[PDB]
């Protein structure tokens, strides 16, 4: 739910660019990927760290039975 | 020489080939990479199991219409109870009392003297419809086919009370259904 | 595995001085948790009355001589507390436990058939 | 293409008066019979001090033993490789007030190892406790809390022993004899306490007790006599 | 003496039963262990004992097939008591076994004898 | 053997004509039966309504008149007697043997060592004094071999069949069929 909020001011910044997509020409265009690039450097880590796996830290541990033989 | 000696059976030795391979790696996957992508981003069995479903959409469904239509019922089927007759037109039951000793749920209760004219009649015959099990066994034990279930199944009553048959009101029910019942017992006579 | 809440393991004890140290601890557990079992109950009557009632079944059991009877009037000792801890018998159960209640001479009896 | 046979109209074979052989149906168990015995006085070998006597029916051996005997038997035939019995299947009682210890608490092990099953027998009483076999094996947990809720037996050991099957605050324990069949008490809703209340028994009709017209006569003989020929103390043959 | 063997790995190609996991060193492991018990049987329980004698008639004809045998199929197959990772938790808890069998004193006179009505059903002895 | 069988060798309503070329233009798989059960065959005549005149089946050694005394077949009174194997019968078949490979003395003698049995005798004294070889013949086997736990079934044994054989769900699938061998 918080990374909602940061994806979703990236999707509504877009708005801008859709209505005017011919009249910003080239210039507008190359932004508008380089507002996309530094908002996916915002995905890669997000993704490296897996922030979003519910994970399983509490439980389906295994052990290994190893005697001690004296 | 059996193969107590180390403590081993034949029902303890595994079968040839019990030990699984080396699981097969991701370089060992038959598919290339981009038919199992296409398999996955194209959803292949989902449209499949979609257009499976689709095939019975024009299919004869199975529905029949009751109560306008009836399925299939058969000579031995249990159902309510009736009380016979002979030809004569007297009662079948001499008062034997046996279906109220096999009854699994004890729903019978008879009470029974010698009649008027000498006979072996009973005077009192109930059974609790909502205590029967509706298993069969009082219509097997009968001697003289006294006790049947009818084929009938659509008694259903707004109070309890009215389950609680008796004599007068088995007997009307084996006026009631006396064809159906033969109907029945010539069919499943010699099975049984 | 594990055991559910408030649970207990169950062994026979050996020593008569050693299951009054229970008893008496086991019977504030049931003070302590007296005003929720009127609040997780909705009971109608204050909580001094189920603190009030809760005694009296203990003494009912004081003067048990023998120790094999010692035990099992002990495991089941745990038993209803653990049960009515964990909100597993129903408000009809425990109202029906506190609601309950000189006899007639021998005339009276007799006039309305006895026992 | 052919057209679909009409079932109902082809040939049925034709029978004249038929046979089949009349024997024994405890015979075929007769070479299990002399492997559980053997097998059974194995066990009895191995731990004199527990196993007090050993029985074999057909096809299923009984190991007898002492209360005090149970988790060193049960151990025993957990763990030993002759006899790996990983698996218990049931655990349960059974009620004979005429014995001193009126209940006796029987056991069945399960061997997928060498397709086995064996039986431990060990009696009880109402106040005095059984070993509980949870530590060994996981699957006695509610087979024991069903045994105590419906035969009181005191299981020592146990991690947690509670009713299963009856209500919550069921006085008695069902399954002894002397328990009636209809219980003690019954439920209604009362409209004045809006709420499902307990009242004493009160049967409109009374069960009828008609086990009373059982028979007068013995319905089986003495049996028959099945020890495999191995296993009888031979007769001191008479002298010249 | 501190000789620490693995009994049930936690990890690697699985066996066919589910947490099964094969075992990184089979044959030198079974050695291992039914040289122990070999050598620990005698330690604690006497010799009149029949289980001794039991254990040391296949616990001997265990440890002769392990060494005979480097092909792990020709051991299973000759044991014939499943997997040779099943073997190692045999071996295991025969070893297990032996320190209690010696604790309990299984080979002395019945402890509790059952009473004279104990294993009589409904009027007879059994 | 299991093998896929052509749908109009099925009990059950198939189209006809150009609907049926329709149908197998347009399925998945031709050969799979729509369900609905063939109007003339299935259940036609009911079973209120059969031919069949039924007759009560008696085979001939229990239904005869002959040759057929009720005490030859009479098997639930011959039933095995329950017997119980105490320790003092364990000790009196170790010491003596059994009757088949008897160890008693005949005579008046023999009857002095059955009647020793005859009363308590505790197996743990009993094992401590014998012959070794006893143990090794009578209580153990094969030479001291342990008794493994007898089978209730000899024949049950178990094979890995393939997809090839047993039609079900090809190697990829993480289930393995059995066979008898
Ligand atoms: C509506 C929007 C538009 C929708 C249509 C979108 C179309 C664009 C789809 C994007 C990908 C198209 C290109 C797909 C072919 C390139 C991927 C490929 O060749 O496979 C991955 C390849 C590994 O080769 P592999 O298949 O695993 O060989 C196994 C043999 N048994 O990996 C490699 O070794 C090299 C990978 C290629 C390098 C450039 C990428
Ligand atoms: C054309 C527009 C309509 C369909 C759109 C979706 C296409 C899905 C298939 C592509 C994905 C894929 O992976 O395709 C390939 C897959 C799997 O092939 P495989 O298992 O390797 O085949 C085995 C080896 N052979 C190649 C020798 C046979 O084929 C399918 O499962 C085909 C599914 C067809 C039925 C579903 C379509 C009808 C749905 C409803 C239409 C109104
Ligand atoms: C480049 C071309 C772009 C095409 C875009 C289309 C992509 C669609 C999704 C494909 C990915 C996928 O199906 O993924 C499957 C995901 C997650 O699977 P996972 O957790 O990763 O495990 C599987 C992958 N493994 C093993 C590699 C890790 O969950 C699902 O089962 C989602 C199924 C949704 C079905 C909803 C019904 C369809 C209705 C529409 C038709 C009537
Ligand atoms: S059908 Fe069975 S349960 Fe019902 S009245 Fe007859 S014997 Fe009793
Ligand atoms: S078994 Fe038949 S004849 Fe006998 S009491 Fe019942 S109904 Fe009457």
């Not at chain 2, 399925?71 to 009392?97: D, T």
């Not at chain 4, 007090?52 to 009984?62: G, M």
């Not at chain 6, 049926?20 to 079973?47: A, M, W």
């Given at each position: ?70 | ?192 | ?9 169950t062994r026979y004890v050996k020593d008569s001085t050693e299951m009054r140290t229970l008893v008496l601890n086991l019977y ?28 009296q079944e203990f003494e009912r059991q004081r003067f048990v001589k023998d120790l094999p009877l010692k035990n099992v009037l002990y495991m089941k000792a745990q038993m209803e ?35 | ?65 002492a209360p005090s ?26 009620d004979?007030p005429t014995r001193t210890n009126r209940f006796?608490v ?17 009696y009880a009483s109402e106040v005095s406790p059984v070993p ?16 105590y809720?419906?035969f009181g037996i005191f299981f020592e050991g146990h991690?947690?022993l ?9 006085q008695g324990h069902?399954?002894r004899?002397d ?62 | ?111 509790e004898?059952?009473l004279?009505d104990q ?8 | ?181």
């Open positions: 739910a918080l990374l909602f909020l940061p994806f979703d001011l990236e999707v509504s910044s877009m708005l801008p660019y859709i209505v005017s997509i011919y009249s910003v020409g080239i210039y507008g265009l190359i932004i508008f990927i380089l507002f996309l690039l530094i908002l996916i450097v915002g995905f890669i880590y997000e993704f490296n760290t897996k922030s979003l796996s519910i994970t399983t830290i509490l439980h389906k541990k295994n052990k290994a039975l190893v005697k001690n033989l004296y | 020489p059996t193969l107590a000696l180390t403590s081993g059976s034949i029902q303890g030795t595994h079968p040839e080939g019990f030990r699984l391979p080396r699981p097969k790696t991701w370089e060992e996957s038959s598919e290339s990479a981009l038919s199992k992508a296409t398999k996955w981003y194209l959803l292949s069995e989902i449209f499949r199991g979609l257009y499976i479903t689709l095939e019975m959409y024009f299919r004869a469904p199975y529905t029949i219409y009751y109560p306008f239509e009836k399925g299939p019922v058969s000579p031995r089927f249990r159902g309510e109870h009736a009380l016979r007759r002979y030809p004569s037109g007297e009662e079948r039951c001499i008062a034997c009392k046996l279906c109220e000793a096999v009854c699994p749920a004890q729903a019978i209760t008879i009470e029974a003297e010698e009649r008027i004219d000498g006979s072996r009649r009973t005077y009192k015959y109930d059974i609790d419809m909502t205590k029967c099990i509706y298993c069969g066994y009082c219509q097997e034990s009968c001697p003289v086919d006294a006790i049947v279930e009818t084929p009938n199944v659509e008694y259903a009553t707004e109070t309890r009370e009215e389950l609680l048959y008796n004599k007068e009101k088995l007997l009307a029910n084996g006026d009631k259904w006396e064809q159906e019942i033969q109907y029945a017992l010539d069919a499943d006579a010699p099975y049984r | 595995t594990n055991p559910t809440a408030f649970a207990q393991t504030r557990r049931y003070l302590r948790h007296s005003r929720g079992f009127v609040n997780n109950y909705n009971l109608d009557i204050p909580a001094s009355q189920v603190r009030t009632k809760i005694r507390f653990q049960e009515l801890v964990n909100f597993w018998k129903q408000q009809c159960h425990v109202m029906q436990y506190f609601e309950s209640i000189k006899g007639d001479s021998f005339v009276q009896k007799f006039l309305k058939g006895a026992q | 293409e052919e057209p679909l046979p009409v079932l109902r109209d082809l040939p049925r074979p034709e029978y004249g008066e038929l046979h089949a052989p009349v024997y024994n149906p405890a015979e075929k168990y007769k070479e299990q019979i002399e492997e559980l015995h053997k097998f059974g006085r194995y066990i009895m070998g191995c731990l004199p001090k527990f196993v007090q006597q050993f029985s074999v029916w057909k096809d299923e051996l009984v190991i007898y033993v005997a149970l988790t060193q038997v049960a151990t025993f035939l957990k763990d030993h490789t002759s006899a790996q019995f990983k698996a218990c299947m049931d655990v349960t009682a059974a004979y006796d029987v056991y069945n092990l399960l061997s997928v190892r060498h397709n086995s099953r064996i039986r431990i027998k060990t509980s076999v949870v530590p060994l094996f996981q699957g006695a947990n509610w087979f024991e809390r069903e045994t809720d419906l991690p947690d509670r009713r299963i099957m009856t209500d919550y605050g069921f069902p399954l004899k328990f009636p069949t209809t219980g003690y008490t019954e439920v209604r809703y009362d409209a004045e306490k809006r709420r499902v209340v307990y009242e004493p028994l009160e049967l409109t009709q009374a069960w009828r007790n008609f086990t009373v017209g059982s028979s007068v006569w013995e319905q089986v003989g003495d049996g028959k006599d099945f020890t495999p020929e191995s296993f009888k103390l031979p007769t001191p043959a008479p002298d010249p | 003496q501190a000789q620490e063997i693995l009994i049930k790995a936690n990890k690697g190609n699985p066996t066919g039963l589910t947490g099964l996991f094969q075992h990184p060193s089979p044959r030198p492991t079974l050695i291992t262990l039914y040289k122990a018990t070999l050598k620990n049987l005698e330690e604690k329980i006497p010799k009149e004992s029949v289980y001794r004698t039991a254990v040391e008639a296949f616990t001997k004809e265990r440890l002769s097939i392990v060494e005979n045998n480097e092909i792990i199929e020709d051991i299973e197959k000759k044991i014939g008591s499943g997997l040779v990772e099943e073997l190692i938790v045999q071996a295991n808890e025969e070893y297990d076994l032996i320190d209690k069998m010696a604790e309990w004193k299984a080979w002395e006179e019945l402890e004898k059952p004279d294993w009589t059903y409904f009027g007879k002895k059994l | 053997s299991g093998g896929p069988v052509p749908v109009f060798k099925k009990y059950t309503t198939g189209s006809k004509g150009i609907w049926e070329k329709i149908r197998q233009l347009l399925t998945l798989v031709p050969n799979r039966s729509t369900g609905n059960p063939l109007v003339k065959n299935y259940r036609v005549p009911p079973p209120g309504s059969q031919t069949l005149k039924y007759k009560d089946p008696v085979t001939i050694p229990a239904g005869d008149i002959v040759k057929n005394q009720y005490y030859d077949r009479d098997h639930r009174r011959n039933y095995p007697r329950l017997v119980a194997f105490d320790q003092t019968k364990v000790s009196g078949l170790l010491t003596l043997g059994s009757a088949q490979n008897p160890r008693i003395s005949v005579g008046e003698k023999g009857q002095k060592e059955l009647a020793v049995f005859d009363q308590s005798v505790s197996l743990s004294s009993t094992l401590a004094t014998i012959d070794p070889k006893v143990v090794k013949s009578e209580l153990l086997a094969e030479g001291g071999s342990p008794v493994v736990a007898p089978s209730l079934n000899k024949k049950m044994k178990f094979r890995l069949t393939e997809e090839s054989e047993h039609g079900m769900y090809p190697e990829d699938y993480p289930i393995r069929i059995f066979a008898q061998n």
